[PDB]
Design a protein around this ligand. Sequence first.
Ligand SMILES: N[C@H]1CC[C@H](O)CC1
Ligand SMILES: [Ca+2]
Length: 223
Amino acid sequence: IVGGYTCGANTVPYQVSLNSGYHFCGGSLINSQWVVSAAHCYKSGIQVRLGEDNINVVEGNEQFISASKSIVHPSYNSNTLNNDIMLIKLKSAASLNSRVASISLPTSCASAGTQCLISGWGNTKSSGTSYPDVLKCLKAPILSDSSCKSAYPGQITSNMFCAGYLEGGKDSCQGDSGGPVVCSGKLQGIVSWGSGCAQKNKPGVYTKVCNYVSWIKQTIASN
Ligand SMILES: N[C@H]1CC[C@H](O)CC1
Ligand SMILES: [Ca+2]
């Protein structure tokens, strides 16, 4: 997260870190056994880390649970990043509490102008490289489809939305991939892609989660 703030320990209780020897992606806990992340975060050997603040220190509220199964969206295209969504099932159910909690799926799509919370352990610099170890947060509005398409000609599908600031300076970045965009207590987005981070007229692009609720529910119900 570039131009954000320190969230505070366990204040984003649905935020997970995906770990394969190291943090490589964010995710969102949507029930005791399932995490939603980005399809481009797919790899084998995933351990889901819940209750994290400092990802380099065991602080006492963590639950480390290995993934039993990953399900990338059937229509995910890695070139265009269309349908950039995946589900990860935990080998055992997480113990839910105030610091480890699921986030609600949307019942309807959020509109341009809606304020959201974006979070993650990604790069905090737009030019250099500095990785924080505590969770960073950014409050950011959803942008109009028209401004999103104008920022990224030929690249924005019906399964994507822009959020952030056209002036630059505040954005998600490398390492935030797969993490949450939550608006009014609903998971509306997944950190997906962008051109650099926090660059003028290049806001972050996010997977439009409301399009996938039926797929998520049915997949969970049979897996
Ligand atoms: N704003 C996006 C966040 C994820 C990334 O890998 C590229 C920039
Ligand atoms: Ca920790």
